[PDB]
């Protein structure tokens with residue numbers, strides 16, 4: 220029994236190694252400490268100082284450099300006793316200060332223990348190296364075990380959720396959030412892995428469920444500067460079960476796919492995996508039928524300078540992808556078509572618009588153009604017209620307009636983006652019919668999306684994501700405001716103002732004003748931003764109009780202020796595509812293409828704007844969550860460099876500050892963070908009472924009784940005692 224076998228990998232890899240002695244005595248030392256900053260500029264930095272003097276209301280401790288210093292007892296970051304270094308739940312700590320929190324996580328991570336609980340959260344820190352804790356053998360261990368009965372692990376949370384589902388007959392959720400490269404997607408896959416094993420029917424459906432992923436990963440993931448396999452879309456996966464607890468189906472909901480990546484990537488980044496998969500792995504035959512060449516031959520793939528990922532065979536991955544397409548069930552038919560779309564996109568990208576005779580766009584070469592048409596199975600002359608000579612309504616008048624180079628290009632870009640996003644939608648719908656169950660009994664849904672985004676530049680997509688995050692954070696706080704209550708002040712009240720600033724109807728918030736502006740064809744970024752400032756500058760406490768910038772505005776989010784830039788918002792909100800282009804493509808010969816333009820469910824939004832659609836999909840998701848028993852996983856990146864063995868304090872604390880763990884902590888820290896079992900308190904603290912005593916509670920008053928700790932510091936409740944913050948350490952800080 221791996222859990223009892225101190226030699227198993229379970230022990231090696233998931234527990235703090237245990238010695239031969241369990242005695243309270245080894246742990247002794249008289250030397251107290253505090254966490255201080257040897258330089259206050261940079262506050263996430265701390266060193267341990269041995270407190271050598273105590274004023275009546277402050278301490279005076281000894282720097283690592285030997286110099287003594289003074290401190291207020293109330294500003295003191297007390298270091299928990301060493302016995303606590305490495306505990307499995309931060310809730311077990313006496314001193315719940317941030318450095319204290321950072322220290323426990325670091326001590327663990329130093330042992331390659333990447334998972335740790337903090338109350339209701341599972342904290343997961345990317346090790347940036349492979350740890351073999353996801354084997355079937357590791358799966359097996361988690362089966363039916365309580366949270367408290369096994370080491371922290373994604374497997375654990377998953378079991379607890381599945382058991383809760385069976386036991387309470389209630390749907391569940393796991394919300395997996397954090398920065399890019401934190402391991403959200405990785406962990407998401409382990410949840411499904413685990414579920415598939417503990418509950419699959421020893422299989423077709425399960426294989427399909429599993430193969431859908433790689434499918435969506437090829438089309439929605441890409442190499443970026445923070446992650447070789449970045450998810451450029453958010454997702455909510457519903458794992459469906461029958462009443463007996465068996466997997467009966469699945470559904471995927473996708474959000475905010477980064478369509479622009481198809482047309483542009485920053486230096487070092489790559490376009491979506493698939494482009495490269497197609498090009499590297501296509502038979503030397505399709506290459507031709509598709510008019511393929513190499514990546515360098517394509518504007519959409521030859522700009523970033525990076526066309527490869529180390530440790531990655533685009534060719535092999537392509538094998539993998541088509542393989543998944545087969546399992547799920549896409550006909551070879553379907554598959555050439557997908558491939559063609561892809562090919563087409565690439566061609567559309569190579570079309571060069573020139574300066575003809577005056578001011579209007581022309582096409583000297585038609586090569587790329589016909590390559591494009593060919594593959595899509597559209598009429599090249601139509602396309603051509605549709606691209607440079609779109610007919611535009613101007614009254615009762617329908618007039619062709621000759622676009623200049625630029626405009627033509629952008630329009631071109633719009634087509635590619637529509638093609639891409641639509642195809643993605645279609646992929647998702649298709650997968651769903653195969654997987655999805657009408658008649659499901661229960662479900663476990665997993666949300667894999669980013670946490671708050673504060674980048675160098677924040678645009679419309681950032682506001683969207685941050686908006687979702689305000690809602691999830693308030694959902695958390697609201698949840699915690701119940702869980703905490705039912706031991707045996709609702710802070711979510713707190714996010715309302717920001718939320719309203721974004722989504723409010725009357726008075727209107729940012730999105731409503733954006734929608735309003737969107738009706739006017741001649742509106743501009745300036746008109747827009749000016750409208751925003753008119754309604755909210757010095758008028759809404761969560762808004763800030765900048766001192767000098769004329770194109771940005773600030774929103775005070777849960778995680779702090781985020782400055783956004785307004786450019787292109789109107790256009791992003793409308794996500795326009797010339798009608799002629801729709802017409803052209805409404806006629807494709809190709810069977811798939813036609814669905815993309817012919818199916819209102821794919822080809823359109825309602826027509827609502829992009830904002831209105833985001834808001835509504837967010838509200839549905841939240842409604843879904845609202846009916847589940849939720850579980851929270853906070854994935855942390857250890858540094859910004861993708862390196863193992865480098866847990867950067869500032870990097871870490873920041874995330875803890877923004878993803879709500881620190882708030883969670885400091886909340887309960889105002890109450891009774893510790894609430895130990897009676898028997899449990901007695902066994903290590905007996906040292907009137909001996910270890911395994913049966914009048915537990917009594918044995919528990921007893922110890923507090925000898926030591927005669929202050930009563931308001933502790934509280935007698937059935938089964939457990941609670942200890943206000945710091946009580947434990949001092950209790951722990953006392954002679955035998």
Ligand SMILES: [Mg+2]
Nearest residue numbers: 403404449450
């Ligand atoms: Mg991901």
